[PDB]
């Protein structure tokens with residue numbers, strides 16, 4: 456019999472959980488709280504005509520993919536920014552409070568939708584329009600598609616004119632400085648053949664931020680949308696890192712420091728959110744937990760359940776090149792937050808792409824629920840899962856926080872102290888609503904693979920809880936279903952045994 460103690464103190468360690476950590480990039484079968492228009496296809500997206508380029512993902516084709524995939528009505532295909540306005544309209548219609556729109560910085564955007572761009576047509580060429588951050592002339596709501604340029608501030612002006620600025624209820628709240636710059640030369644060689652330099656990235660980031668904030672001073676700028684650890688450390692061995700990086704532990708610090716320096720010179724904050732992508736490198740059973748992982752591989756599933764610990768747990772060392780060679784940078788969230796505190800205090804943190812794999816397996820659901828609990832507890836500002844609607848358990852993990860009862864019930868927005876005696880077999884997160892502990896929310900995860908786990912709860916609260924309603928998902932179904940309520944609570948203590956591999960949301964009142 457596995458027994459674990461859970462101790463919660465509703466008056467301790469209270470901190471707000473950002474509402475935007477429960478987002479997605481794709482259209483999911485889940486209630487989400489943030490939507491990001493980003494990824495490879497957005498680097499070469501031309502807001503003037505909606506064309507974009509697949510890059511290495513598909514023979515460097517310039518076409519109407521984003522219009523098609525975004526479900527844009529054919530009659531709006533030639534309307535400026537229809538890909539983005541359709542994207543934001545959909546988010547608003549689903550009551551999503553945060554929309555993050557990627558702006559273009561690699562240098563050029565698709566001039567047409569004529570198909571493959573040859574290597575001989577590498578920008579500049581008739582296949583491309585050059586991006587300029589500031590128009591330096593009056594904006595138009597009907598951009599000129601005949602000239603050689605596409606302006607980012609004019610694009611933002613079009614959106615602000617239609618939705619109001621970021622401080623308003625319908626405004627687009629954030630903009631990203633492109634996508635995975637250290638991979639521009641790999642993913643988009645026809646646009647940016649040379650490996651990006653640290654100097655180039657900073658210059659573009661500062662220039663684009665200034666351009667955007669002149670139009671919408673309330674919009675938040677996200678950057679650099681780094682693809683993974685190697686970019687966090689050296690911007691993928693950037694050509695000038697040997698000189699630019701002198702004195703810096705990693706590129707993350709250089710980026711924060713230079714953006715703060717530019718902001719100090721300009722007189723306003725130019726970087727609002729440090730933005731990175733985190734696809735776990737954790738392995739189990741001889742394979743990575745994401746990207747082609749086999750759900751039948753039990754060791755991989757078990758590794759998936761523990762992988763979230765790399766985000767926060769100093770005692771956890773995963774099986775990966777990062778766990779082996781980069782221990783000085785783990786756990787990763789504390790290291791990123793420490794860098795922010797040292798080089799640009801006040802900057803927020805966002806994980807704009809991530810996927811723990813096993814999306815259609817209970818372990819993908821439990822790991823997803825664990826990751827969201829960690830994001831909330833450690834202060835992440837915004838997060839957006841990358842993956843499609845076929846990841847039913849990942850979606851259950853999100854709904855466990857955003858809509859656990861099918862009628863809008865959600866996890867509390869204020870994190871409170873909640874400790875477990877065994878962080879390997881379980882995870883537990885607690886929250887209240889605002890400053891009120893009348894209702895105490897608990898996400899309880901049993902990672903035990905083949906046996907139930909008995910949890911002895913001890914709660915310190917100003918309220919005396921009498922019932923705990925429960926909603927959960929497990930191997931029987933990714934549908935979240937209400938379970939028998941917990942009713943024998945004595946002086947805020949109770950015992951609750953959870954079956955193996957089950958994710959629960961308990962609501963005490």
Ligand SMILES: OC[C@H]1O[C@@H](O[C@H]2[C@H](O)[C@@H](O)[C@H](O[C@H]3[C@H](O)[C@@H](O)[C@H](O[C@H]4[C@H](O)[C@H](O)[C@H](O)O[C@@H]4CO)O[C@@H]3CO)O[C@@H]2CO)[C@H](O)[C@@H](O)[C@@H]1O
Nearest residue numbers: 493494495496497508509512513516518520634635808841
């Ligand atoms: O129009 C031609 C052809 O398109 C086919 O659909 C393609 C589309 O053209 C292509 O652009 C799209 O690319 C995906 C890519 O497959 C995906 O891996 C990638 O994911 C990245 C992301 O960019 C992140 O920044 C980072 O690297 O992580 C994630 C991966 O976890 O995103 C790309 C889009 O941005 O793929 C589709 C499907 O193959 C049509 O199917 C076909 O009918 C058309 O003829």
Ligand SMILES: [Ca+2]
Nearest residue numbers: 599600604605
């Ligand atoms: Ca133009």
Ligand SMILES: [Cl-]
Nearest residue numbers: 635637681682
């Ligand atoms: Cl990158």
Ligand SMILES: [Zn+2]
Nearest residue numbers: 484844845847
């Ligand atoms: Zn689904």
